[PDB]
From a paper:
Chimeric hybrids derived from the rubredoxins of [name] (Pf) and Clostridium pasteurianum (Cp) provide a robust system for the characterization of protein conformational stability and dynamics in a differential mode. A structure design algorithm was applied to the rubredoxins from [name] and the mesophilic bacterium Clostridium pasteurianum (Cp) to generate chimeric proteins in which the predicted hybridization interface can preserve each of the interactions in the parental structures. These "cut-and-paste" models match the ultra-high resolution X-ray models to within the structural variability exhibited by the crystallographically nonequivalent molecules in the unit cell.
The metal binding site-swapped Pf A2K [name] crystallized at pH 5.5 in a P21 space group, with eight molecules per asymmetric unit. In contrast, the P212121 crystals used to determine the Pf [name] structure formed at pH 8.5, with a single molecule in the asymmetric unit. The refinement for all reflections out to 1.04 Å, utilizing anisotropic B-factors and all hydrogens, yielded a final R (Rfree) factor of 13.9% (18.0%). The asymmetric unit is arranged as four pairs of dimers. Residues 20–23 from molecules A-D form an asymmetric interaction with the corresponding loop residues of their dimer partners of molecules E-H. All of the first four molecules of the asymmetric unit agree with one another to within less than 0.3 Å for all sidechain and mainchain heavy atoms, when residues 20–26 are excluded. Despite the differences in sequence, space group and pH conditions, the backbone coordinates of molecule A differ from those of the original search model by an rmsd value of only 0.22 Å, with modestly larger values for Molecules B, C and D. In contrast, the deviations from the backbone coordinates of the search model were approximately 0.6 Å larger for molecules E-H. For Molecules A to D of the metal binding site-swapped Pf A2K [name], sidechains exhibiting dual conformations are Ser 25, Val 44 and Gln 48. The interactions of the three charged residues Lys 29, Glu 31 and Glu 32 vary substantially among the molecules of the asymmetric unit, with the Lys 29 sidechain exhibiting weak electron density. The Asp 35 sidechain of the metal binding site-swapped Pf A2K [name] X-ray structure is rotated out toward the solvent phase, away from the Lys 46 Nζ atom, consistent with the findings of the NMR analysis.
Author numbering: 1 to 53
The structure:
């Protein structure tokens, strides 16, 4: 699946990994993250992530 980078702190959201400690199963597409999911390291919102190319 795809990866997305936090443009504030560099955290990589990996769709294959999800973010299960924060309620996000492995395989959750970025688009389907809840609207108020935030970077698990710096706390910024989804708008600050860029999809890896
Ligand atoms: Zn971050």
């Amino acid at each position: 699946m795809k990866k997305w980078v936090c443009t504030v702190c560099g955290y990589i959201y990996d769709e294959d990994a999800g973010d299960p400690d924060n309620g996000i199963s492995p395989g959750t597409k970025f688009e389907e993250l809840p609207d108020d999911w935030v970077c698990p390291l710096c706390g910024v919102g989804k708008d600050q992530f860029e999809k890896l190319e």
